[PDB]
Structure 1
Amino acid sequence: MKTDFIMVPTAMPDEKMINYQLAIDGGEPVIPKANRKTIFPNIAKEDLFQMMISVQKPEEMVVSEFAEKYRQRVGAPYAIPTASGTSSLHLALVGAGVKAGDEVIVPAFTFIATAQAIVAAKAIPVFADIDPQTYCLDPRQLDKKVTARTKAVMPVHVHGLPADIDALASFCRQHQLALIEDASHAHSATLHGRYCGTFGDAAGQSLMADKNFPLGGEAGIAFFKERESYDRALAFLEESGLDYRMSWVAAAFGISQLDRLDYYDEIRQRNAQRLIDELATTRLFTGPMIPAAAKHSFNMFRIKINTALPEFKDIPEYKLKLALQQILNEEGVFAREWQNTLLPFHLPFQNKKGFGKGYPFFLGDSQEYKHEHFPNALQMLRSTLVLCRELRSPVEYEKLHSYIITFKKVDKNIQRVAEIASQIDDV
Structure 2
Amino acid sequence: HMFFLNLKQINDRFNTEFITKFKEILESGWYILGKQCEKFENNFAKYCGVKHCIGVANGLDALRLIIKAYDFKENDEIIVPANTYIASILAITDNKCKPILIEPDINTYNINPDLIEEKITKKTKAIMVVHLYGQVCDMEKIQLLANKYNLKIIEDCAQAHGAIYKDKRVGNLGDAAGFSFYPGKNLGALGDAGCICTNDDNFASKIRALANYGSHKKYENLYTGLNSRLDEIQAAFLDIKLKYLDEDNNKRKNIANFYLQNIKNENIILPSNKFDHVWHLFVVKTKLRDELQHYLNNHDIQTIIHYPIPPHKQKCYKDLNHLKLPITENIHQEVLSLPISPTMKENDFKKVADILNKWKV
TM-score by length of 1: 0.75
Deviations 1:182-210 (A, max 9, x none): 00011122222522111010110101111
By how many angstroms is 1:36 displaced? 5.1
| Partner residue in 2 for 1:140 | 114
In 1, Cα distance between equivalents of 2:243 and 2:42 = 14
| Partner residue in 2 for 1:107 | 81
Contact 2:130/2:137 (8 A) holds in 1: yes
Deviations 1:31-60 (A, max 9, x none): xx4x55752142322222222233333332
In 2, Cα distance between equivalents of 1:252 and 1:146 = 42
Instruction: Tell me the C-alpha RMSD between the 2 structures.
Output: 2.0
* Partner SS, residue 24 of structure 2: helix
| Partner residue in 2 for 1:290 | 273
In 1, Cα distance between equivalents of 2:318 and 2:291 = 31
Q: Percent identity?
A: 24
Map 1:64-83 to 2 at 5 A.
64-83=38-57
* Partner SS, residue 177 of structure 2: strand
Are the structure 2 counterparts of residues 98 and 222 from structure 1 closer, same or farther at C-alpha, using a change threshold of 3 Å? Answer: farther
By how many angstroms is 1:405 displaced? 0.8
* One-letter code aligned to 2:282: F
1:223 aligns with 2:223: no
Are the structure 2 counterparts of residues 241 and 171 from structure 1 closer, same or farther at C-alpha, using a change threshold of 3 Å? Answer: closer
* One-letter code aligned to 2:175: D
| Partner residue in 2 for 1:255 | 239
Which runs of 5 or more structure 1 residues have no equivalent in the other structure? Answer: 1-32, 306-316, 352-367, 418-427
| Partner residue in 1 for 2:329 | 378
| Partner residue in 1 for 2:252 | 268
Deviations 1:100-132 (A, max 9, x none): 432111122222221121123332211222111
Contact 2:4/2:301 (8 A) holds in 1: no
Contact 1:92/1:224 (8 A) holds in 2: no
* Partner SS, residue 56 of structure 1: helix
| Partner residue in 2 for 1:48 | 19
Contact 1:180/1:202 (8 A) holds in 2: yes
In 1, Cα distance between equivalents of 2:163 and 2:343 = 16
Contact 1:156/1:181 (8 A) holds in 2: yes
Are the structure 2 counterparts of residues 273 and 264 from structure 1 closer, same or farther at C-alpha, using a change threshold of 3 Å? Answer: same
* Partner SS, residue 246 of structure 2: helix
Contact 1:93/1:202 (8 A) holds in 2: no
Deviations 1:210-265 (A, max 9, x none): 11101121000001132232234345433113111111121121121112323322
Contact 1:219/1:250 (8 A) holds in 2: yes
* Partner SS, residue 245 of structure 1: coil
Which of 328, 340, 356 is matched with 1:391 structurally?
340
Contact 1:94/1:232 (8 A) holds in 2: no
Map 1:177-256 to 2 at 5 A.
177-236=151-210, 237-238=214-215, 239-256=223-240
Contact 1:96/1:201 (8 A) holds in 2: no
In 1, Cα distance between equivalents of 2:105 and 2:260 = 19
- Give the 4+ runs in structure 1 shifted more than 6 A: none
* One-letter code aligned to 1:47: F
Are the structure 2 counterparts of residues 392 and 99 from structure 1 closer, same or farther at C-alpha, using a change threshold of 3 Å? Answer: farther
Map 1:271-420 to 2 at 5 A.
271-279=255-263, 281-291=264-274, 294-305=275-286, 317=287, 320-350=288-318, 369-371=321-323, 373-387=324-338, 390-410=339-359, 413=360, 417=361
| Partner residue in 1 for 2:148 | 174
